[PDB]
Amino acid sequence: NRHFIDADPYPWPYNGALRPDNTALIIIDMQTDFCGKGGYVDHMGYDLSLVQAPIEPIKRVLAAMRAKGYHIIHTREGHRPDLADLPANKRWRSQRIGAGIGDPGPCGRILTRGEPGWDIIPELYPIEGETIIDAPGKGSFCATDLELVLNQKRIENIILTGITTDVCVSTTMREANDRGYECLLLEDCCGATDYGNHLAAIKMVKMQGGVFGSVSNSAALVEALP
Amino acid sequence: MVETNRHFIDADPYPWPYNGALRPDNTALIIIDMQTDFCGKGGYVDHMGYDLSLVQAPIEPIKRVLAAMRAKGYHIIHTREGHRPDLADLPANKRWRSQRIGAGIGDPGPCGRILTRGEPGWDIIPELYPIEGETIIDAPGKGSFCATDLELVLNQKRIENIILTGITTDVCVSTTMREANDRGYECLLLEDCCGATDYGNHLAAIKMVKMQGGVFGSVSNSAALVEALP
Amino acid sequence: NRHFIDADPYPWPYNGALRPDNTALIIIDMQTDFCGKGGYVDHMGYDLSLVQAPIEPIKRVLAAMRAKGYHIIHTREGHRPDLADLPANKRWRSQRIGAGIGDPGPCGRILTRGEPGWDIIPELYPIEGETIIDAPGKGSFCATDLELVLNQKRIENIILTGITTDVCVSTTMREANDRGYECLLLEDCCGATDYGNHLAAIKMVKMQGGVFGSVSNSAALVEALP
Amino acid sequence: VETNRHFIDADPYPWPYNGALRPDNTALIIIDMQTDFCGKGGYVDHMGYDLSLVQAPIEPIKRVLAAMRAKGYHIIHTREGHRPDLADLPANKRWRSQRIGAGIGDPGPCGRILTRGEPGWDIIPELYPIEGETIIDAPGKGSFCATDLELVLNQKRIENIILTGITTDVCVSTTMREANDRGYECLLLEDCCGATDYGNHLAAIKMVKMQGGVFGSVSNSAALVEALP
Ligand SMILES: *C(=O)N[C@H](CC(=O)O)C(=O)O
Ligand SMILES: *C(=O)N[C@H](CC(=O)O)C(=O)O
Ligand SMILES: [Cl-]
């Protein structure tokens, strides 16, 4: 009763135990300030097109997985409004490049929970019953209840999407993989500030027989999802 | 002369550590996974067919940094990737992948059971071997924090700054750097003191650190570190 | 420049390093359903006076520590409204005793975040800049950002207050102590609905030369606080 | 009529809650049965406490251990202790131990107190591990803190934990609380634990039972061995 998705370097999940009850989609950090028109990344002159590219592929995967009753998880990078969870080095770096965490930005206080720019874009917005993780780090496990939630949901397989490929998505994939989760990265459903770094982060997954999991794409996933 | 207790290492994209609070008592070198298994002739990496020269290149630069930091009384930490001999800490997917490529964790190899604690090939290479008082972390994951006492030890030592070296750049070194950075540690990657299975991935992992004003920390090299280390 | 509070079994903190910048008060779980008139605990016929007794002593300690600029932290036990963070055993036990988590109670859904009964009582309500931890467990560290926050605040010493002495306060003290925090339990600022269990939890702290820290009272704290 | 649900008579509810009791999903944990905690010349003896209270659980544990080994249950052991360079030793923990005359790392009759690799730190011969039984080396009172215990339980797919060992109110209770918060279903065997003060042992057990079994449920060696599938 095994089911696989075509993937590189191996068909995923490794053991073919692919079911709605044991598999989650995670959509990482698809937040207005990071990928929306008029947010701080846009206003700062970064190559926003590369982080907007995955929106439509993610929307298709999200719709397909919702329709088949898979677990859906979302994450948002951000800080408590009093900045109690903000490391000093993280703050200092953000100030130095002109996007100081907690400082006023075009869509509210930058990377601050409760602010408009911090929230998930409307095109990928969560619905009731979809867990949202609020993460103070780049990895979604650090200082959150993500692992507790995955354990109570009995999730074994995670399909990763979102931004950026080399920062938050890679970090979360690496954390999950170390703990024994079986992870699939959808290459057309992620993007980064630097396309080369996006491509390299993907390549890194595949080495050593799939050191962090396996890699596929939205079409292959939607076509073969049970 | 005007003297300061703030000290920096020339680094990219910013002089490191960010606040200049660089002292023996608050700074550690970490040497990641310099094991016969990752960089010597008969280990898991060798078994997978990779070019050992890429992962041996950092040995001499690491040794120079290690000697300098030992001499000035900095904290020194070492890590080893590996599993309990009964494999109780080995995820099924990790095991399966290693078997599929012909380097099964726990399977017999030329230097003992692959990636298995207590086996000859699993140990740190003699030229970078720990000495007394240097904490060794035994990690079942690619990130040295997961399921270990690394964080507990860093906290009791009051370490604020970490200088990262070892292998591989894109797997264990990058993962550990990311974990440390998320928790607030201030991290410096020494680019000539790491290496990978694929040189492009090594270079990209280094570039990833520098983006967004040093998203994971900053990057320097052994010569610049040794020259400016207080 | 050492300062100590009279305490049993040793004057606290052990090294006398007692300052506003390195010391936090934590007020654990002073929530309406647990200690308020008409909450679920009151309706079940527990002796609410035992969990109300700490309110006035806590108020005194809180006022003194606020005035001197110490760190103040609050905790609330509770679950996400979709119950994604709720272990099945925890749920089952709560149902069996007629106080099912997420079920309708006299002050809203029991132990559910955002419900009236779940919030902190008005007499001990947080003010801006006082971090609130929302905990799905009895120990306030599990699956939260408490440790991350303590680390960024450079907190070394923790003064524990709140309820219940033997469940959430003891668990949090044990977690903190294992990580190296230096903890003071204020015996008149905690309570449990079984007074014997309260007394025993306190005794447990003191054994082996203060195995979990030391124990004092609100008057001794306020008198000697620097 | 047969069922694959199985329960152990326990207080306040029959355990495990859902009757899903199998060798593959259930572990015994034996906490800190070390010469340091229950032997002459160890840490606990140095602090003046009565060793009979912490030796009492030895024979009941031995019986449970034998029964669970014979039926192929997972067996886990823990040892409280520190790296020999004391890198994992909080300063307050050390200071307290010195103040009462049982300093961690200090020389004792059975080697350096609470120090990994020393004779006094090892598990007593009567309850010694065998191959395939995971041993956790814990720098804290709770066996989860800074260890791989949770990773191991997750890879073994363990759902149910039966707790034994010493002391009831310190290491056993702490580990039970940690496990319970994460969703593990825990049974404390009251005759298979003991403490420095019998009243504190009894109270730690009572604390488990309140609020419908806030930390799990409680039974005894005879009831467990009689009903273990
Ligand atoms: C996680 O990766 N979050 C942000 C988004 C950005 O466009 O800067 C990041 O990249 O680190
Ligand atoms: C932490 O102790 N929370 C509650 C309060 C109650 O009165 O029932 C608990 O005891 O579990
Ligand atoms: Cl200075």
Numbering used by the authors:
A (entry chain D), C (entry chain B): 8 to 233
B (entry chain A): 4 to 233
D (entry chain C): 5 to 233
What text does the study give?
Herein, we have described and characterized the structure and catalytic mechanism of BiuH, a cysteine hydrolase that hydrolytically deaminates biuret during cyanuric acid catabolism by R. leguminosarum bv. viciae 3841. BiuH is structurally and mechanistically different from the ‘canonical’ AtzE from Pseudomonas sp. strain ADP, which fulfils the same physiological role; i.e., it liberates a nitrogen atom from the triazine ring and allows further degradation to make all three nitrogen atoms bioavailable. The protein is a tetramer (consistent with SEC); each monomer adopts a five-stranded parallel β-sheet which is surrounded by α-helices. Helices α2, α4 and α5 (residues 95–102, 178–186, and 202–213, respectively) make symmetric interactions to another protomer in the tetramer, forming a dimer, as part of the basis of the quaternary structure.
BiuH and its variants were treated with N-carbamoyl aspartic acid, which is a substrate analog previously demonstrated to inhibit BiuH activity. B. Active site of the Lys142Ala variant of BiuH showing Cys175 bound to the inhibitor N-carbamoyl-D,L-aspartic acid and the difference density map (Fo −Fc), with the active site amino acids and the inhibitor shown in stick and the difference density map (Fo −Fc) in green mesh. Mutagenesis of Asp36 and Lys142 support this mechanism: Asp36 cannot be substituted for other amino acids and Lys142 can only be replaced by an arginine residue (with a ~25-fold reduction in activity relative to the wild-type enzyme). The nucleophile forms a tetrahedral covalent intermediate with the substrate, with the developing oxyanion stabilised by the main-chain nitrogens of Cys175 and Thr171. Thereafter ammonia is released and an acyl intermediate is formed between the substrate and enzyme. This intermediate is subsequently hydrolyzed to release the product (allophanate) and regenerate the active site for further catalysis.
